[PDB]
Amino acid sequence: RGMNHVYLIGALARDPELRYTGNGMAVFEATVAGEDRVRNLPWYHRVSILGKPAEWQAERNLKGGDAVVVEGTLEYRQWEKRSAVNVKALRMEQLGTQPELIQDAGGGVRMSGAMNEVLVLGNVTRDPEIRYTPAGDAVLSLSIAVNENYQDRQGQRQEKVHYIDATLWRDLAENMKELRKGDPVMIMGRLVNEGWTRNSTRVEATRVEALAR
Amino acid sequence: RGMNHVYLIGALARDPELRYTGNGMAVFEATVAGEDRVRNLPWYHRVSILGKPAEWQAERNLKGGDAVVVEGTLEYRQWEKRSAVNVKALRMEQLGTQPELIQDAGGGVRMSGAMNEVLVLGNVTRDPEIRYTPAGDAVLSLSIAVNENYQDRQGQRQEKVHYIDATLWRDLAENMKELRKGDPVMIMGRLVNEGWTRNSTRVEATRVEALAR
C-alpha cells in the first residue's frame, strides 16, 4: 500500500556525473530541467541512480542538453535535524527528437514543452497548516508518509518512510483543510522547488483525493 | 619555471558536494560564480579539491549563496580525444560580508562585484590562429604549455603539462600574432567559459608579455 511515482521529461541541465560514496557505492547524478505550460513555470530537479545501474547509465554517456524521460520515486533523507526530498531513478531514456532549449546564465539548459507529474498515496503525518495570501487565496501545507518495504542483508522485511510535503491551492486547500493526522490521501501534481529562510522540494497538487478511513 | 595562478572571489552557486573517485579518493566540488565590472560579464567555474583537504573543506560546511575567496591553479585533463581545463584549489575562505546575489532560473546564484584573475606563464604549443570579426576586430587563439613538476610514488621527479587556451582581442591579438611554437609568454586575464559546437574554459587576456627567447 502507498504509491510513490514521478515522471519527468526534461533536458539534462549540464553533463551528469558519475561518482562514488565513502562506502564505494556508485552514484550517478543528473539535473533534469524543464518548463511546462500549466505561465511557463521552470523546474530543475536532481535525479540520482545508485549502484550498478548508475554505472550502466553513465555508460550511455548522455550530455548536457540531451532530452530524457525519467521514471522515478521521491526519496526522503534525514541528517543532523535537516531533511531533503530528491528524485531517485533506475534509468533515463534519451528522446529521439531535439528539444527546444532555454539557456540560463550559469550555462544550464532546460527544455520547453516538458513534462512533470507526481502521483503519491500515503497518510497525513500531522494536522495541516492553512494560510491565506493577502488577497485571500487559500494555501494548505500537507505532509504525508509514504511507506516502502525492503529486504535488509539478512533477508528480513524492513520498512522505510518517505515524508513528502505538498502544497494545495484555493479550492484544493479549502476542500482538504479538515484532514487529520493518519488520514489516507492520494495527491497528484507537479514536483517543484520552493525557496524559504533553505530549499524544499514539494508537490504542488493539481488533484487530491481523501481515501476511505 | 612557468606560472599557474587563478584567484576568484564569487558566490557558491549551490551547495558544494563531497564525493569519492572509483579509487576511493575524496573529491570536493563547488561552483564559484560571479560577475565583474570589466558590461557585467557573468562566470561560473567548477572548483575541485582532492584528498584529505577535500574532507577538511567539506567540514567547513559552506552552502550555496556563501561568498568565498579561492586561490587555485588551472588543471588540464585529457580522455578518449577530448580535454577540459578546470580550477583546482586546496581550500576556500568564506567572506565575512554578505554578497549581493543574482539568482538564475536554475536556482543558482552569483555574486555581483566579484573578482576573477588569472596569471599564467608557459610556452606557445602551436602557431596561433588569427581571425577577424566581421567589423574587423582581431581575435587570436593562443595555446600554451604550462609545465608542473611532481613526485610519484617512488620519489622520482616527473613532469605534468597543462595546455591552457587563451583568447586575445584587438591590439593584444595584433601584437602577439607573430608568436611561434616554443615562444615563452606570460598571460594575464580572466577565466571564462566559451561555448562552441561543446564547452571550453579559456583565459580572456587583459595583458600579454612575450618573454626573451
UniProtKB/Swiss-Prot annotation, chains A, B:
Stretches assigned to the SSB domain: 3-96, 115-212
Molecular-function annotations in GO: enzyme activator activity; single-stranded DNA binding
One GO process term, biological-process aspect: DNA repair
Record bears the keyword Transcription regulation: no
Induction: Constitutively expressed, highly up-regulated following ionizing radiation for at least 12 hours (at protein level).
One term under GO cellular component: nucleoid
Predominant localisation class: cytoplasm
Keywords attached to this entry: Cytoplasm, DNA damage, DNA recombination, DNA repair, DNA replication, DNA-binding, Repeat
Protein localization: Cytoplasm
Domain of life per record: Bacteria
Phenotype upon loss of function: Essential, it cannot be knocked out. As SSB levels are depleted growth slows, tolerance to ionizing radiation and UV light decreases rapidly. Cannot be complemented by ddrB.
Quaternary structure and partners: Homodimer. Binds ssDNA. Interacts with DdrB.
Stated role: Plays an important role in DNA replication, recombination and repair. Binds to ssDNA and to an array of partner proteins to recruit them to their sites of action during DNA metabolism. Essential for ionizing radiation resistance. Stimulates the 5'-3' DNA helicase activity of RecD-like helicase. Stimulates RecA protein-promoted DNA three-strand exchange reactions in vitro with both D.radiodurans and E.coli-derived RecA. Complements an ssb deletion in E.coli, but does not complement a ddrb disruption in D.radiodurans.
The name this protein goes by in its record: Single-stranded DNA-binding protein
Organism of origin: Deinococcus radiodurans (strain ATCC 13939 / DSM 20539 / JCM 16871 / CCUG 27074 / LMG 4051 / NBRC 15346 / NCIMB 9279 / VKM B-1422 / R1)
Name of the encoding gene: ssb
Residues of the full protein shown: 3 to 233 of 301
